[PDB]
């Protein structure tokens, strides 16, 4: 079906320290809106909860004339499997593996975190992160079983200093997408984020808006 209801297991490691969350959200398959909630099954987080956003589900997100291609994978059944990594100004790096199953409207997710050289006293380890900028990603196609999406991501720390991070994520489809796909790239998607957190807890929100007017959106992306 649409999705409708997901949940998510995000695990894994942070500066060689295993965590591991669980939580069920909802979203709106026709705007892309998705609502998570998590909760630690080890405890106390030793790191900045921001750095699991934007990582903690594109089946919830449309086109402007129909279904995108992962909402597409999810509906017929053949889905997709996700690489994110993600290189920080300190010389901290992060990855994710992401995969799926569906159930009618529901989406079960896990997401596999690796994220070294976070410094002791830089704002990952101390939990000084405070909000992160929304952004524009760019979607291109490589071939019929991939997508790439690229983009640059902040997070907030002191009086608006930033924290920032380059981001490339793969995307590998088990059957080609659809045709006209190809022909109708790049792809730009605004997002929003939004994270209520405590040291166990967390409640996340995402907005997203795709766009198939190419222009000089690549001017404006970058």
Known sequence: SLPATHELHIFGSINGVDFDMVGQGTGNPNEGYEELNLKSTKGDLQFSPWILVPHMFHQYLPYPDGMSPFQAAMVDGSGYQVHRTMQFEDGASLTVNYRYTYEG??????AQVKG???????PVMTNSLTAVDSCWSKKT??????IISTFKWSYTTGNGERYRSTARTTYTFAKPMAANYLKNQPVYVFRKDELKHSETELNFKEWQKAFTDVMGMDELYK
């Open 105 to 110: 409207s529901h989406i079960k997710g896990e």
């Open 116 to 122: 070294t050289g976070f410094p002791a006293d830089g």
């Open 141 to 146: 196609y490589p071939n019929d079983k991939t």
